[PDB]
Structure formats: C-alpha cells, structure tokens
C-alpha cells in the first residue's frame with residue numbers, strides 16, 4: 001500500500017468545477033461505460049427474440065428473458081470477484097483499464113454480424129469486464145480527496161449522477177438507433193461509447209490520478225500466488241473437461257446454465273449466512289444481528305426482483321402489450337428503459353429533503369425497507385389492471401409509466417439505506433465483505449427472476465403480476481410489523 005497523503009500529493013486538486021480534474025476522468029470513464037452497458041441492455045432482449053428476418057436471433061421470448069436475468073445476476077456477482085482482483089492482484093487503476101478493454105471487446109462481438117455464439121462470447125466478456133471496471137473506478141474517486149476534504153460527498157454525488165445520466169440517455173441514443181435502423185448499429189454505438197471511456201481514461205489518468213489505484217493494496221504472498229495459480233489452472237482444466245463431454249452428450253445447455261445460476265442464487269446467500277453465524281470471530285451480539293439482517297436481506301431480494309424485472313419482463317411488456325402508436329407517433333419500446341433513471345434524477349432530491357424535514361420523525365431503516373417493498377408490490381398490482389380490465393389488445397402506455405414511477409418511490413426508500421443496514425448488522429470481522437453482501441441480495445433476486453420467466457405469458461399475466469406483487473405486499477406488511485425490534489437492535 002501507499003499512504004493516503006502521498007497519494008493525495010500526487011493528485012491535482014483542481015480543474016473540474018471546483019473538484020480535482022481526476023473527477024473528470026472518472027466521471028466520463030464511468031459515464032461512457034454505463035452509457036454503453038445500458039444502451040446495449042435496452043435493446044438486447046429484443047435482439048434475442050425478434051425474428052431473424054427482423055435482424056434478431058429468433059430465440060423464444062422466454063429464453064431471452066431468462067438469459068437477460070442471468071446476465072444481470074452474473075454482472076452483480078462479477079463485481080465481487082472484480083473487487084478482489086483489484087484489491088489483491090491488479091490495483092484499481094489497472095482493473096479499470098483491463099475491464100474497459102474486455103467490455104469494449106464484448107460490444108464489438110455484438111456489433112459485427114453474428115448469431116447466438118457471438119452473444120454468449122459478448123456476455124462473458126462484458127460480465128468479466130464490468131466486474132473489473134465498475135466497482136474499481138468508484139474506489140479511485142475516494143482516492144483523489146485528502147482526508148478531511150469537504151468536497152468528497154459532493155464529488156461522489158457528481159460521479160454517481162453520471163451513472164444515472166448514462167442510464168437515461170443510452171436508451172434514447174442506442175435504443176433509437178438499434179430499433180429504428182439495425183440492431184448491430186446499436187451495438188456499434190455502444191462499442192464506440194466504451195471506446196470513448198477508454199480513451200479518456202488512458203489519455204488523462206497519468207496527470208489526473210497520479211498514484212491513485214496504481215498499487216496493490218492487499219497483495220498475495222509468494223506462496224499464495226502459487227496456490228492461486230494452481231487452483232485456477234486445475235479449475236480451468238476441470239471446467240473444460242466437463243463441457244467437452246457435456247455440451248454434446250451431457251447434456252449441458254443454456255437451460256442447465258440458467259438452472260445452475262438459479263441454484264447458486266439460493267445456495268450462496270445461505271452459505272454466507274451460515275459462515276457469518278457460525279464464525280468463531282464473532283460476538284454473541286453480532287450473531288443476533290446476523291439473524292436480524294435476514295428479513296432485511298429477504299426484503300431486499302424481493303424488492304430487486306421486481307425492480308430488475310423493469311429491464312426484462314416490463315421490456316417485453318413495452319414491446320408486446322403496450323400501445324406504442326400514440327399521439328401520431330411511434331414510441332420505441334426501448335425508450336421505457338429511460339424512465340427509471342429519469343424518475344431517480346427528479347425524485348432523489350425531493351426524498352432527501354423529505355427525510356431532512358422529517359428528522360426524528362422519519363421512518364427507521366427497517367421501515368424504509370418495508371416501504372420499498374410495499375411500493376414494489378403496488379407497482380405490479382397497478383400493471384396487471386389494464387390487461388385485466390380490457391378484453392384484450394394493447395394497453396395505454398400511461399400504465400407502464402405509472403408502474404415505473406411507483407417502483408422508483410420504493411427504490412428511494414430502500415436503496416439508499418441498503419448499504420447502511422448491511423454494515424450495521426454484519427459482524428466486525430466481516431466488515432470488508434459488506435458491499436458484496438448488499439450486492440448479493442440483488443444477484444440472488446435476478447437469479448431467481450430467471451426461473452420465474454416461464455410463468456410470464458399473455459394467458460396468466462394477471463396471476464403473474466398479482467402473485468409477485470401480492471407476495472411483496474405481504475412481505476412488506478410482515479417487515480413493518482417486526483421493524484420495531486430490528487431497528488432498536490441496529491448498531492449505529
């Protein structure tokens with residue numbers, strides 16, 4: 001490691017709206033990565049299930065939705081792996097660079113003419129690369145501000161804004177291009193996007209970031225390096241040999257893989273919980289907190305399950321169930337992916353001010369989890385209504401807009417205290433695993449989403465949204481009820 005002072009001395013403190021110019025490097029690196037990721041995502045599902053004669057891959061709709069859910073799950077998991085690689089082998093600056101390259105390569109694999117193999121390579125590359133870039137670019141931003149710098153919070157706010165900004169614009173740019181012209185054009189704009197991110201990062205990182213992220217904070221010892229190398233190699237050959245017999249004669253298919261991820265999405269959280277609870281490095285008080293954290297973890301998973309379907313199930317809904325020809329124009333179904341970030345950008349400051357105004361009277365953290373869940377469930381009840389009231393046919397887009405609006409109301413309750421809840425209830429020995437634990441509730445939710453896709457059909461649409469929405473409402477009520485004790489139990 002290097003001391004934070006010498007690192008700070010190596011980073012310029014001016015140059016970007018009162019902030020260090022390094023914030024420019026990090027804002028735009030991350031903006032373009034998110035832009036590219038979200039643009040590609042706004043059209044990917046359609047690319048999968050649109051007919052071959054329409055530029056698509058001609059996959060079954062259900063398979064496309066399942067793949068999309070596993071995709072998000074794997075991306076969430078990858079960030080855990082990626083964080084460890086920066087911390088113990090690459091440093092963060094180099095993780096960002098390699099991640100970017102991998103991401104760019106992933107987009108190119110889609111931008112060129114290709115079929116379903118190209119899609120699978122593209123996913124792998126983007127899963128790996130986003131794992132390396134996304135958590136680590138954010139680690140570097142803290143590194144620019146010396147301890148005690150009052151600009152730090154604001155610098156993080158500006159940085160995070162770029163992410164939402166990327167999320168808002170991408171469906172309007174890549175979404176429009178991909179749907180109106182050609183899918184590969186869309187994927188190409190995503191590729192160019194990431195390229196601009198790489199360009200800004202490589203061209204400016206030396207002067208703007210100085211020493212930040214250039215060292216390995218927690219390096220493996222020589223013996224560890226040999227251990228890791230052996231485990232990897234053996235691991236690589238063992239995976240390879242299974243697939244050799246399995247892909248033709250196993251059989252190992254995309255269905256198996258989707259199932260596997262589903263299994264893992266349940267198994268992993270359970271192991272994490274057992275390990276934390278049984279750990280000899282924990283106090284009796286910490287053990288009670290781990291137990292207290294379970295309903296919060298479940299509420300989170302349920303919440304993200306609904307929220308993450310905004311990019312899968314509801315994307316299909318925008319495309320197959322929604323009246324797009326309104327006001328003399330034709331709406332692109334991908335454009336609905338701009339609604340979640342838009343509402344976040346607008347409502348976040350309103351909520352902030354609200355909690356301030358509430359002060360001592362504001363809901364506790366477990367109560368805000370509950371509220372998030374209640375709103376998420378409500379968003380699904382709302383969405384079932386028009387298809388239920390109509391005999392058939394496309395429904396007015398205002399309903400989908402309202403459903404996205406409502407889930408945002410829930411997101412601004414639960415999400416901003418998610419990390420805080422996790423840190424307050426995890427044992428001190430596991431303080432470093434705190435971001436992973438929080439990300440895991442999302443990963444698990446999307447892993448499960450992929451197994452729920454078979455239930456989504458025009459015929460049981462009502463049972464689908466109704467059952468999931470009802471589950472969330474029920475869970476939200478139970479959480480409200482047990483929230484008092486969970487709150488008093490919180491560390492602080």
Ligand SMILES: CCCCCCCC/C=C\CCCCCCCC(=O)O
Pocket residue numbers: 089090094124125128
């Ligand atoms: C689907 C993606 C898989 C292909 C990409 C993975 C390739 C792995 C190759 C070997 C990793 C070792 C190279 C790392 C460079 C280290 C640079 C440094 O430490 O300074």
